Symmetry: D4
């Protein structure tokens, strides 16, 4: 089963980071969420109730990304995957990628970040 | 067998969406289609009749994307995969990705969408 | 005097537009603001009090772009130029460009919009 | 008076070109239109009737770009400027830029084209 | 063994295509080549003779892409994979992707093309 | 008279540069040419003989950019402007911009270069 | 005289900013420098000694951008323009644009900054 | 286990290359590093000590990329993978991609390079 529902390049201004100054100034966090969902019923029915609402997922990601500042991207993604898996039984597995395009790293790069994959139990 | 025929970033202005206002205003839909096709005969012969015509595939996608408005991206992709699989026996499997880069979601992101993979029976 | 202070590609999700459906769904508005300001004193002093604060300007633009929905981009830009000119005497003239990259126009384009230039009286 | 109304990166697939093969195959034409229009009344009133409708302008450009094939970009732009100037008295001057990003020129470049500026008489 | 040597976005102006007009006018062909090669010896030695020369590979691709016009992308890629596999025993497998970003297809898309994977016998 | 004919982002691999190593290795040179030409006759007539051929201009630029290596970008642009002005009486003035996106400068930048404007005598 | 020598998109990681946290964490500063220089002698001679060395200019910009942290972009640009004007008599005027693409401003934008133009006395 | 920590598009100006002239002039090297690391503990704890520090990894890559010039990209990547695997036991495997976007290859392409994957022993 290779069907997926995705939300790409979601950007949020947040205050996460292990560094005091980061928590103070903040920065933009980029988030990609890919959900493993069987979409054949919805493909047949065309009834919005047979699939997972992208809009609702964005709201969940947003509430976590624009909420309380935490130290790690690992913790933010764990909370997002866990939030999506908990509320949608149709999601067989959740992939969350978070990128800091402008972290406190003296250099020239496109971004740094993490990616996790959590199956829905 | 890892050979594929692809059509990337096809853009169509359509009226699909579960929201009345979407159906009224419309938006641009981005579509990626990847077809699993054994291309060694055509690679040998160079005869256009031994492969699947990209132009014809685009026409099929277009007729569906610019046709009657439906609620879901899931339904649009199901119709496209089913249309391609039905008319081309050489296509072993069809992957259809549809992205709404500008859906009615208050936020900053690159796009939202779905992706399905349907083997040709 | 060719010195300027600028804010490029500011993006806001708003509900402006002459069409009911636009007001309902909303869309992203892109805004460029260029201010004619003599920057030699600040270039000499390095004292933030001798120039116009980009951060404060962004806040002004934001309050207007994310506020009450109006029909025209012309009206939004007039309000922004007027807001900036009114609060900063050092701004000799304000240029405001607003782009709707995804208006209700069935077609393929990069964007549509307006640009105004208002001298500070 | 530096106010303008603009339409950027409009893309149309057409068959214009002095070469037979071009007329046969076609290509994408990119068009930028900038109109000199005094926008202060509309900025005051917020009444759509006090400005020039971007949507209507796009329709005009489209009808010319997707219509009968001609030899020159110069002729296409002359027809567009003339069409806009004729129907809108508020347009003091029309600038039309047309780019062939992929003309029959053996080489590597971003595009070739012309730009004209026609005052409204 | 997941090591690879790659050449991305190689662009050549050629005259390939099943349509007479294409052969006459030509267009830009984009080519991506990925070679499966064990790079640990070279990683140890740092001796250029223990790996496959990217420059030589580009020359091979070029000679085929800028040579005699053929009908299919399938045939061009088959010739490239076969050319690389034949001359380099260290290449365990060759992947060739060819994209026509501007084919004679009336529409808006990013590109169309094929991709093949050929193991070296 | 604000009409212009332009060729943007022409790229050529050349060996120009004041440094021996540059002459040996080479690099990509990016060239923009803007010609001041009255395009109203051609806009009226649609006859290719009433304007300046973009294709011919590209050929001229190419012959200079891919020819004998010289030390300066200033000299290359002077030769191009002079070549275009000499062969086309309809060109009232020629602007030539040449960019070295990857010169032997240890740093991070988008490009360095020169731009000249030469009226046709 | 419209000839210019330019350096575009120079990027430096620095610690400038009126905010303590900025000075602590730092960020990338983007700089564009355009110099008004008569390039006809060099265009004639092809002798590097008749023009201004882009490499030397970059070094000057770099020494200022990667040096002591100051509060304002206005001060940094004033120092750069003044440094270039002082060391090169052939530079009739220096334009310096500095952009903070990621300042401590909670929002979505492309960048904020200033631009100054200083004639060489 | 599909969790990863990544650093994308790191750019360094170095002098690596098998050609004398390359070693003399230098060029920009682009590096992507993907680390296979189990991130669930850190996702639970939010304690920076339970994961691998992206900043420290960048420093390692940098020290190798901006250090002594070597002939091959294969050798540079082998040293990086080996450096990361050696210092971090939590890294189960290291993927290093190095791209020369502007090598001494007369042509038009996006880049050439290699990619290696080394499990941590
Ligand atoms: N795995 C992970 N996940 C997160 O969410 C993290 N947040 N930080 C984090 C915490 C504290 C500092 C930094 C940071 O980027 N520091 C950059 C830096 C780190 C280590 C060593 C050097 C540097 S930069 C440097 C080095 C030498 C001189 C001057 C500088 C610039 O400050 C990041 N690391 C994370 N790792
Ligand atoms: N899986 C899927 N597939 C499709 O094809 C869909 N079309 N829509 C769809 C239908 C109705 C509404 C929307 C939509 O994007 N609504 C966005 C939204 C949804 C849910 C909750 C909030 C919001 S936005 C919001 C929230 C609070 C205040 C103000 C707003 C902006 O309207 C999308 N959802 C789909 N899901
Ligand atoms: N100068 C200006 N400023 C603003 O802020 C505006 N907002 N709108 C606005 C208001 C109402 C409708 C639209 C709009 O874009 N409509 C697009 C459209 C307009 C006119 C004619 C045709 C079309 S699209 C079309 C045409 C034929 C068939 C189907 C369609 C798609 O609806 C925009 N126009 C503005 N002009
Ligand atoms: N000012 C202007 N405006 C237009 O609208 C034009 N359409 N064409 C046009 C007409 C006929 C041919 C071409 C074209 O691009 N030909 C390219 C070309 C022209 C002249 C000389 C050489 C070439 S390409 C070439 C050269 C040598 C060998 C092989 C080739 C590839 O065919 C363009 N020129 C225009 N000029
Ligand atoms: N698998 C494959 N590989 C190649 O290398 C190919 N080259 N062509 C090829 C050959 C002949 C024509 C075309 C082409 O793109 N034609 C586009 C087109 C094809 C089929 C049906 C319609 C169209 S476009 C169209 C349709 C209706 C009206 C007007 C038009 C524009 O001409 C491409 N097809 C290939 N397929
Ligand atoms: N106006 C102009 N026009 C041209 O066409 C030029 N070609 N070169 C040119 C000639 C010789 C060297 C270079 C070059 O870019 N050198 C870069 C450099 C120049 C001056 C000072 C330092 C550097 S880089 C540097 C500095 C210190 C240590 C290590 C390095 C890297 O080599 C360029 N300069 C031009 N100027
Ligand atoms: N003209 C100019 N030049 C420079 O070089 C400047 N550096 N700063 C500067 C100094 C201090 C703070 C900031 C900054 O961007 N602050 C952003 C901000 C400023 C003013 C008001 C609000 C904000 S953001 C905000 C607002 C409300 C709640 C939360 C936040 C996020 O901190 C920038 N301003 C400059 N102006
Ligand atoms: N696998 C690998 N890894 C590295 O790190 C390499 N560095 N070089 C390397 C060494 C020496 C030369 C070049 C180079 O790119 N040369 C380009 C070139 C190579 C072979 C054949 C032709 C050419 S370009 C050419 C051809 C004909 C005429 C004129 C030219 C331009 O010089 C690269 N090759 C590598 N391969």
């Amino acid at each position: 089963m290779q069907d997926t529902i995705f939300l790409k390049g979601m950007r949020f201004y947040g205050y996460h980071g292990a560094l005091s100054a980061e928590n103070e100034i903040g920065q933009i966090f980029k988030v990609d969420v890919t959900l493993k969902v069987d979409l054949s019923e919805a493909g047949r029915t065309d009834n919005v109730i047979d699939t997972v609402h992208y809009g609702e997922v964005f709201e969940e990601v947003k509430s976590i990304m624009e909420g309380k500042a935490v130290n790690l991207l690992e913790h933010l993604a764990e909370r997002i995957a866990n939030r999506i898996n908990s509320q949608y039984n149709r999601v067989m597995e959740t992939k969350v990628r978070i990128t800091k395009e402008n972290p406190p790293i003296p250099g020239h790069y496109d971004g740094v970040g993490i990616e996790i994959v959590r199956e829905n139990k």
